């Protein structure tokens, strides 16, 4: 009537009433444990400080809300739950929210209109009371022990903003399933997010801790934990980015070059509801991502760009308090970030007029492992890059490593060779042709053309209708 009531003893069945196979589940229904074997008994600190949790939605199924509200509750030691602000982002239903209000330690908070994701949390962020804060989706499941890890690490260092990983609750039938903790965020020069496996030289470092902390470029997305105090002093988020997502870009970024870093910790967990074809699951409107590229890229930006052409036409808003805040912060240039947060990340030579894979279709140029005057061929594109990354140059040649392609004999059905670059040779200059549609012999009538494929290799032919001469190269700089 006026009372707040334990979480056991709220009525669930009553609330949920008032895709579906979420409401058949328990409100505090029981999940595998999905932690290494190393995590069981780690022993965590009595003397860590209590966190707000902020939890954001816009018309959320009440039984994943619920479900993700007590999941905080049963999951955590209390004494460090300080409380759980729930954030409605101007639901239909406010009863959706306000209902919860009953449960011990929830406080719910409306919104007159649609914010978004991004300002409901900053007022989330400012209505909290604890020292720390951790934002959650309105649809996740926290495992085992989730909370101690992620606040050992804030505890120790304030800059770092740590995640756990995040498993993969089903949206049809809400299988909870373990995510890989091999992985980091990544990007391709798209900006759109990538899992990355860990360097080859940081999979040995983990050797002799295989549950330690992971450094992460980019940030899975929404579940992490940060300092309070840090959250602001960086500038909470960017209060202009529309709701389509791409903060993760911007946060990220601004995290790294501003003196901070990001992290997965792997004795963290706590399951997700992914929607379907979520860039996390399934391997654009630019604004947010402009908003982040312009101000933090650099003279990057032209990569994205070079990826992206439909993308600057796409108004994004003023981003001049952005720009004050990365000049009062200090903050180092996005070529730092490359060079010593994302060295994996592969850069065209400022100089290449064309770079990345170079693909008919969804086939892709590849080398067979041809490593000397070998012939070359197609494979599927495969989006990593080694035998299907290329380059077209200033010199005008179509280069992968220090090998280029070369027109060995100019005679129509010839086969292409991939020899030894040198600046001297006229047989290894290319030229784009038809919008960027074509590979053509400089001086001559002759098409880089893959009829061939199955006879021998690419083959030099008469430049013509031909689709089987149709290449485009995944950034173009003109
Ligand atoms: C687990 C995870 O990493 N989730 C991230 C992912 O979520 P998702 O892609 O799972 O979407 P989400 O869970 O943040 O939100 C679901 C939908 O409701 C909308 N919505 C949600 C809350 C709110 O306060 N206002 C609002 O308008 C939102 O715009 C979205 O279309 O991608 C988002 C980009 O948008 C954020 O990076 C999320 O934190
Ligand atoms: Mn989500």
């Not at 707000?52 to 004494?79: C, D, G, Y």
């Not at 991939?418 to 042709?433: A, H, V, Y």
């Not at 400089?442 to 001469?469: F, H, I, M, W, Y």
Request: contains cysteine.
């Amino acid at each position: 009537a006026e009372a707040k009531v334990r979480w056991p003893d709220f009525n669930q069945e009553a609330y949920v009433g008032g895709q579906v196979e979420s409401d058949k589940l328990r409100m505090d229904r029981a999940i595998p444990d999905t932690r290494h074997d190393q995590c069981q008994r780690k022993q965590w600190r009595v003397d860590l400080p209590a966190t707000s949790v902020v939890i954001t939605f816009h018309n959320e199924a009440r039984s994943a809300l619920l479900r993700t509200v007590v999941s905080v509750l049963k999951k955590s030691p209390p004494h460090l739950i300080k409380e759980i602000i729930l954030v409605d982002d101007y639901s239909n239903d406010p009863e959706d929210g306000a209902l919860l209000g009953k449960i011990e330690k929830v406080r719910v908070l409306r919104n007159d209109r649609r914010e978004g994701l991004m300002r409901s949390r900053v007022r989330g962020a400012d209505a909290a009371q604890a020292k720390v804060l951790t934002f959650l989706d309105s649809h996740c499941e926290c495992n085992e022990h989730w909370l101690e890890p992620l606040l050992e690490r804030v505890a120790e260092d304030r800059t770092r903003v740590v995640s756990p990983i995040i498993d993969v609750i089903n949206m049809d039938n809400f299988q909870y399933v373990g995510a890989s903790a091999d992985l980091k965020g990544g990007f391709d020069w798209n900006l759109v997010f990538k899992w990355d496996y860990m360097t080859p030289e940081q999979r040995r470092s983990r050797q002799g801790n295989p549950v330690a902390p992971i450094k992460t470029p980019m940030i899975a997305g929404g579940l992490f934990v940060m300092d309070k105090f840090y959250f602001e002093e960086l500038g909470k988020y960017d209060m202009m980015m529309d709701v389509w997502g791409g903060e993760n870009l911007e946060i990220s970024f601004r995290v790294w070059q501003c003196g901070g870093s990001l992290e997965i910790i792997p004795c963290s967990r706590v399951g997700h509801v992914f929607r379907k074809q979520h860039p996390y699951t399934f391997p654009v409107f630019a604004r947010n991502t402009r908003r982040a590229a312009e101000v933090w890229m650099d003279e990057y930006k032209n990569f994205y760009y070079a990826a992206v052409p439909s993308a600057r036409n796409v108004p994004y808003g003023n981003i001049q308090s952005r720009l004050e805040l990365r000049k009062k912060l200090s903050c180092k240039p996005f070529k730092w970030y490359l060079e010593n947060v994302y060295p994996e990340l592969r850069v065209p030579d400022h100089q290449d007029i064309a770079f990345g894979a170079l693909q008919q279709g969804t086939n892709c140029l590849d080398t067979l492992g041809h490593f000397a005057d070998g012939v070359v061929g197609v494979y599927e594109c495969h989006n990593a890059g080694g035998n299907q990354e290329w380059a077209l140059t200033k010199e005008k040649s179509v280069k992968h490593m220090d090998l280029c392609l070369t027109v060995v004999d100019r005679a129509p059905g010839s086969l292409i060779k991939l020899q030894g670059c040198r600046e001297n040779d006229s047989r290894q200059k290319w030229e784009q042709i038809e919008g960027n549609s074509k590979l053509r012999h400089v001086g001559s009538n002759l098409c880089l053309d893959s009829r061939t494929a199955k006879s021998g290799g690419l083959s030099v032919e008469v430049c013509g209708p031909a689709l089987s001469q149709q290449w485009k190269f995944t950034l173009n700089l003109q």
